[PDB]
Design a protein around this motif. Structure first.
Motif, mmCIF file in Angstrom:
data_model
loop_
_atom_site.group_PDB
_atom_site.id
_atom_site.type_symbol
_atom_site.label_atom_id
_atom_site.label_comp_id
_atom_site.label_asym_id
_atom_site.label_seq_id
_atom_site.Cartn_x
_atom_site.Cartn_y
_atom_site.Cartn_z
ATOM 1 N N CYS A 116 57.286 47.955 26.762
ATOM 2 C CA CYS A 116 57.357 47.889 28.216
ATOM 3 C C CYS A 116 56.200 48.641 28.860
ATOM 4 C CB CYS A 116 58.689 48.453 28.717
ATOM 5 S SG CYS A 116 60.147 47.517 28.210
ATOM 6 N N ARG A 172 48.244 42.489 27.774
ATOM 7 C CA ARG A 172 48.476 41.056 27.622
ATOM 8 C C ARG A 172 47.275 40.356 26.993
ATOM 9 N NH1 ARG A 172 46.558 37.643 31.263
ATOM 10 N NH2 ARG A 172 47.103 35.419 31.110
ATOM 11 N N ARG A 180 47.947 37.823 22.214
ATOM 12 C CA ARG A 180 48.116 36.539 22.882
ATOM 13 C C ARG A 180 49.354 35.814 22.370
ATOM 14 N NH1 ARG A 180 42.478 36.790 21.869
ATOM 15 N NH2 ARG A 180 42.707 35.529 19.967
ATOM 16 N N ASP A 181 49.259 35.238 21.175
ATOM 17 C CA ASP A 181 50.382 34.554 20.548
ATOM 18 C C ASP A 181 51.109 35.425 19.533
ATOM 19 O OD1 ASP A 181 49.376 33.812 17.622
ATOM 20 O OD2 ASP A 181 47.704 33.410 18.987
ATOM 21 N N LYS A 207 55.796 37.461 22.638
ATOM 22 C CA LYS A 207 56.310 36.613 23.704
ATOM 23 C C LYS A 207 56.398 37.421 24.990
ATOM 24 C CE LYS A 207 60.162 34.487 22.837
ATOM 25 N NZ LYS A 207 59.731 33.064 22.819
ATOM 26 N N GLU A 208 55.824 36.885 26.066
ATOM 27 C CA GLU A 208 56.049 37.461 27.383
ATOM 28 C C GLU A 208 57.538 37.425 27.688
ATOM 29 O OE1 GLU A 208 53.511 37.220 30.726
ATOM 30 O OE2 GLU A 208 52.127 35.809 29.760
ATOM 31 N N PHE A 259 56.733 43.552 26.425
ATOM 32 C CA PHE A 259 56.388 42.639 25.341
ATOM 33 C C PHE A 259 57.262 42.925 24.126
ATOM 34 C CE2 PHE A 259 52.672 40.802 27.302
ATOM 35 C CZ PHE A 259 52.200 41.797 28.136
ATOM 36 N N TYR A 270 44.184 41.517 16.607
ATOM 37 C CA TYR A 270 44.923 40.264 16.731
ATOM 38 C C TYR A 270 45.068 39.524 15.399
ATOM 39 C CZ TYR A 270 45.360 35.220 17.692
ATOM 40 O OH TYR A 270 45.715 33.891 17.663
ATOM 41 N N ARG A 283 52.875 33.448 13.704
ATOM 42 C CA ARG A 283 52.852 31.990 13.613
ATOM 43 C C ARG A 283 54.051 31.452 12.844
ATOM 44 N NH1 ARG A 283 46.617 31.359 11.484
ATOM 45 N NH2 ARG A 283 45.680 32.866 12.938
ATOM 46 N N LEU A 312 56.494 33.312 35.543
ATOM 47 C CA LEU A 312 57.166 34.164 34.566
ATOM 48 C C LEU A 312 58.633 33.795 34.400
ATOM 49 C CD1 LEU A 312 55.674 37.738 35.124
ATOM 50 C CD2 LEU A 312 55.192 36.068 33.322
ATOM 51 N N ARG A 338 58.632 30.029 31.264
ATOM 52 C CA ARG A 338 57.416 30.339 30.522
ATOM 53 C C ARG A 338 56.956 29.151 29.688
ATOM 54 N NH1 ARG A 338 60.921 34.702 29.850
ATOM 55 N NH2 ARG A 338 61.279 34.110 27.663
#
Ligand SMILES: *[C@@H]1O[C@H](CO)[C@@H](O[C@@H]2O[C@H](CO)[C@@H](O[C@@H]3O[C@H](CO)[C@@H](O)[C@H](O)[C@@H]3O)[C@H](O)[C@H]2NC(C)=O)[C@H](O)[C@H]1NC(C)=O
Ligand SMILES: *[C@@H]1O[C@H](CO)[C@@H](O[C@@H]2O[C@H](CO)[C@@H](O)[C@H](O)[C@H]2NC(C)=O)[C@H](O)[C@H]1NC(C)=O
Ligand SMILES: *[C@@H]1O[C@H](CO)[C@@H](O[C@@H]2O[C@H](CO)[C@@H](O)[C@H](O)[C@H]2NC(C)=O)[C@H](O)[C@H]1NC(C)=O
Ligand SMILES: *[C@@H]1O[C@H](CO)[C@@H](O[C@@H]2O[C@H](CO)[C@@H](O)[C@H](O)[C@H]2NC(C)=O)[C@H](O)[C@H]1NC(C)=O
Ligand SMILES: *[C@@H]1O[C@H](CO)[C@@H](O)[C@H](O)[C@H]1NC(C)=O
Ligand SMILES: *[C@@H]1O[C@H](CO)[C@@H](O)[C@H](O)[C@H]1NC(C)=O
Lengths: 311, 156, 313, 159, 170, 313
Positions: free
Chosen positions: A1, B111, B115-116, B119-120, B125, B143, B151, D112, D115
């Protein structure tokens, strides 16, 4: 967070678009605090007159007691000891402004009472020692030997500094009172200076009694340059000078009206409600300030938000 | 915006991370303190120019000049009050918007790092340990290390 | 799902520190530009208006000037009043007297010493014709001699009223030394006016002058405020313009003298302008500089419009 | 990216849906109206007005003092005129940038929310799974549930 | 906040404008500044400097000391407003510079990220957000292909399949 | 293949300050604080300034033999301390008002109104012209002729189209002996007449200090004679009478300027005792005492905006 700080903060600030907002930490830029007593201005004690006007202390009013440097002058709203014998002072305010800040001030005897020998003059309006008296620093010339002659005397400034001379004329109540005091019917005072050229004449007029006195006495003043000479010549209405004041003028201030009394301190800003010790840019203490002060504002709270909003 | 209420339990600084693991960002906090402290000082110090002041010295037959002195004194009280009150109101909002930008820019600083690989989800996060979350604060996060681990659990 | 913002058929434009001419949804102007073109009261207080008279002509009993208004907020006199002093002369501290009378809480004319007690004979000139037949100022008396000499006049008025009292008097300056003996037998003359505050003695100034309203002689006027329990003492040898009427005064506020050609309308305002009053809550206006009362700040601009809505395309 | 704005939207300042079956956001608009109302009000109400009288009361032998009253009337005019002009230009930019902010903050309020269940088209619009009128009140409310429609999005995405 | 953010450095080799692109192609590597965004900003900053200078009103004043020694109270009164107006103008100008200096530097931060999102929204999954403010294409893109990222006329569904296939190769 | 987005950067050293950040390096910056002046006096709107190299306004207005023609000026410059004020010592009544009225003049032309031949004449060594003592050129010193001083009655009437400025004076001798020697009668008067002016001056015999070897004094007066008005003189015998006057047209106002610099054929909108200013900028820091349409005076050294983006070189 990912988050931000939050605490038990009660200080509130305002936004141009939000009426009422809570904030982590807030800082005030509006000084609202004073110390309630006079102090020194840049390390210089002011000249304080307890119950004396500038004219009453400059002249020799017996009610006022007999300092070479002051940053500003304090006198009460209405001093109770102005002119014990009623009258007016010519250019009194410009003289007060001239004396608001003086670097060197020293009373000097120029023409003593011994040299005035027409006789002196006394009134019950100015009680000094329970007995009728007159101003300490000036002399009232009254005829002697029942014949008033011409009085010709001159003083020449021999000091390295400027000196301030005061004198005056007496306006009797009626034509009979003058002949008793001054045998000549028509009378003049002629004061001569490289700058000054005046000639005073008494004005007989029926007036109301002030301090039990119907007559009046009107005073004048000039500055005598360090090598100039002042010349007096009177047929006999003369209030002649006995003392003078060496003056060194290096800066200007004002006359302050405050009922406060002195405390041994120092300040950069003065206020008739007490000096201010602040580096802030704004204050709402008083409009009548002396010295380097913040700007006077009509507001209660001028608080910025140093921290982020917190709910 | 998205991160609501903030944390009462954060005392390190103003902007910070929260970690829930099996086992504050001073950079953003230090730049913010220096910016706001500079704002307060400049509002106090750029007006440092001040000279002597006086009171009132006009008699009863000089009241027209006394009124002229009243016009300029009341005129400057009107100017300084309106400027200061608006300066406080205006700069307070710019201070609150300055904190809104710092939090979201700190949200993108993390962020952009992953990236991948995640998950947002509230501004929150593979597995990541206590030494792994140094990389999130510093701006030095890798990364391709946990790429395949994400993945494969993404398509589960 | 699409997200968008409003737009309407609005041509109103505002300006921006980085953009000029932005077509905007909603706009609000904060610059006041409208006035009602007429004199209105001030917080419920009427103003003192003189159509063709100056304050000197209205205060002294100028025969042309007309009106017992007990209270007023400010004073209006037109650009060049045609009725000042019917007999030419000067008014001492005239501007300071006008600033004092600009706002008076209570005003009432009082007879202090009547014309009967001054029976010297009364003086009249053709410069002050009331109705073709010559008269004088109605509030003051021109004291000319009687028979062969000018016996010293000694008259005093001890104020017993509860308010401060404004006294007016004057001295006549004849044209030549021959005219004085004809009017006031003594060649050397004086006027001594005494007060606990005032100590004055006047001497006429004989000088050849040009005719103004058919008169080469002049008349200079003076004034003081007699405190409630104070007394004023007049002792004159001639050339005396004596007070017959005075004014009780209560002073509670200050104002200014206004120059405007308009006349009164039964309206009330908080801000007045020589071109017409203003009823504005706006912080700025551009009507006229010479304003009276609580007013917006005078600014030199034509449009000061804020943007309240978002931009339109 | 949102070009031209919606002219057919009169409900307020700030969603548009093309569903098989315009409704402005009540919260984001009213909170915006409250702010702009407060800005104009604070600009006016912070002004301090006192009783003052201006009259040109100095005679011809007092013209130096008359010139001094001139220099201060002229000084205050130049101050207020310059401040009132620049205050408008500064606050008008803030207001229009504030409206660009409220539009974008609502774009991320929906982005958001949904998503990987939709695709950012690029005009401020998204294309969803299927969603109805009572499903888009859930998007407006803020009460949009992600785990309900997650599998349908993950499956129609591999097509 | 993009200038102090992910685009850490400013391209010292770009002279065409203020904001621009840089392409790395097998056919060539070079800079091309976005004239649409730069001209909007060059006119934008000039509009601010001019409005600060033009909105000032000057109406001729003669400032000189004309009072003698027995008028020092009026002399001090003129001093109070002379010194008072110097304090008003000095403070307002100094803070006006500081306030608008910030709004200029932040105006450049916003214009960069808006242009970064202009490319990011344009090509969506046909490239990967590297993090330097740069995108690496999933497909091949020559010199004429990069008019469209600058112009805004970039066709996503043309090269999408090339991005969908060169991505699953893992 | 790749695409990168960035901003401009150049070899720049100019710095600006931000309300939150200090010493920020910038691509390009512009200054708005004027610090430049050319160091020489100029005109205002192409109208020259009346410059007195070693003379005061009174010394130049009167005919001081040590003082050295211009029909129009925008403002006046005089040195810090002129060495040619009044050669014969004395005062000038309402001298500052007279200077302020003459600060900006539209038309100025010396006119002979009552010549020397009509007026015997007196001289003093305090006003040397060429070794031999002389007197003020624009006025005449009336001393008694044939040992008996009679009354003078001379009236000049303004027949020109403009207002004209009359000057005159009175002599205050040292003692009563010098008066009788120069002015036979012991008691003296001087009366000047005008539709506006009424005065009667009596000399002051008083012992004084020597100034330029002179204990006597001469005090000067002035009025503005309206176009069709006339001035009348009547003197017992202390008269210093005018021989020349000045037609004036009053359309604007400036101030009296104090600087030691001189003229160059230049022009400017704003004047400064250190050199003119050619600025479109809104602020400056040259000098507080300015004349003309000027930027606002500011107590600072740097007012630099940021025209370009922040740079890291
Ligand atoms: C102006 O008129 C007033 C009204 O008469 C005068 O005031 C009065 O003066 C007399 C004598 O000076 C006072 O007489 C006395 O009262 C006290 C007690 O209060 C008593 O002890 C005395 O024996 C005498 O009876 C009178 O009180 C006083 N009135 C007031 C209201 O003060 C005044 O004198 C006149 N002014 C002049 C200078 O003529
Ligand atoms: C802003 O745009 C308007 C028009 O686009 C310009 O003003 C016009 O000016 C002329 C000349 O006074 C008038 O006849 C028109 O009535 C005006 N139209 C409108 C709607 O304003 C204005 O000059 C522009 N401002 C700037 C700074 O370029
Ligand atoms: C004031 O006193 C000084 C001191 O004597 C006088 O100055 C002298 O003047 C004479 C003649 O002018 C000179 O010869 C002396 O050298 C001067 N002395 C000094 C010290 O300067 C002065 O004259 C007196 N003032 C008056 C007018 O009497
Ligand atoms: C100043 O001179 C003018 C011109 O002679 C005089 O003005 C005239 O006066 C006569 C008689 O009073 C009239 O017949 C003329 O018509 C007047 N001319 C104008 C233009 O009005 C004037 O009276 C003289 N002034 C004084 C004070 O004597
Ligand atoms: C702000 O709130 C406090 C208490 O909530 C109250 O005292 C004050 O009156 C409020 N201000 C306004 C303008 O409503
Ligand atoms: C800013 O730079 C100037 C010279 O570059 C220097 O005088 C000053 O000390 C600097 N300020 C700080 C805080 O470094």
């Amino acid at each position: 967070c990912i988050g931000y700080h939050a605490n038990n903060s009660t200080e509130q600030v305002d936004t141009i678009m939000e009426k009422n907002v809570t904030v982590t930490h807030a800082q005030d830029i509006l000084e609202k605090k004073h110390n309630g007593k006079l102090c020194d201005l840049d390390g210089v004690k002011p000249l304080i007159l307890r119950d004396c006007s500038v004219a009453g202390w400059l002249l020799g009013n017996p009610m006022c007691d007999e300092v070479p440097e002051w940053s500003y002058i304090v006198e009460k709203a209405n001093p109770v000891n102005d002119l014990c014998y009623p009258g007016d002072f010519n250019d009194y305010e410009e003289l007060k402004h001239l004396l608001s800040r003086i670097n060197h001030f020293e009373k000097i005897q120029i023409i003593p009472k011994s040299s005035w020998s027409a006789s002196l003059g006394v009134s019950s309006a100015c009680p000094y020692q329970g007995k009728s008296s007159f101003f300490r620093n000036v002399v009232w010339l009254i005829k002697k030997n029942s014949t008033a002659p011409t009085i010709k005397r001159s003083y020449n400034n021999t000091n390295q500094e400027d000196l301030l001379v005061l004198w005056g004329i007496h306006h009797p109540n009626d034509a009979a009172e003058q002949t008793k005091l001054y045998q000549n019917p028509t009378t003049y005072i002629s004061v001569g200076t490289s700058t000054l050229n005046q000639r005073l004449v008494p004005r007989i007029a029926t007036r109301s009694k002030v301090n039990g006195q119907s007559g009046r006495m009107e005073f004048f003043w000039t500055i005598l340059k360090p090598n100039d000479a002042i010349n007096f010549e009177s047929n006999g209405n003369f209030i002649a000078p006995e003392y003078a004041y060496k003056i060194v003028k290096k800066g200007d201030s004002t006359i302050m009206k405050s009922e406060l009394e002195y405390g041994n301190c120092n300040t950069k800003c003065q206020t008739p409600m007490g000096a201010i010790n602040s580096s802030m840019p704004f204050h709402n203490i008083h409009p009548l300030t002396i010295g380097e002060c913040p700007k006077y504002v009509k507001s209660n709270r001028l608080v910025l938000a140093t921290g982020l909003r917190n709910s | 915006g998205f991160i609501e209420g903030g944390w009462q339990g954060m005392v390190d600084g103003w902007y910070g991370y929260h970690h829930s693991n099996e086992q504050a960002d001073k950079e953003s906090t230090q730049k913010a303190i220096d910016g706001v402290t500079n704002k307060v000082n400049s509002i106090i110090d750029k007006m440092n120019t001040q000279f002597e002041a006086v009171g009132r010295e006009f008699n009863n037959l000089e009241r027209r000049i006394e009124n002229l002195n009243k016009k300029m004194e009341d005129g400057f009280l009107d100017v300084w009050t309106y400027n200061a009150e608006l300066l406080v109101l205006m700069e307070n909002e710019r201070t609150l918007d300055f904190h809104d930008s710092n939090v979201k820019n700190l949200y993108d600083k993390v962020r952009l790092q992953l990236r991948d690989n995640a998950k947002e989800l509230n501004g929150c996060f593979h597995k990541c340990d206590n030494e792994c979350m140094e990389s999130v604060r510093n701006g030095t996060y890798d990364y391709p290390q946990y790429s395949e681990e994400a993945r494969l659990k993404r398509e589960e």
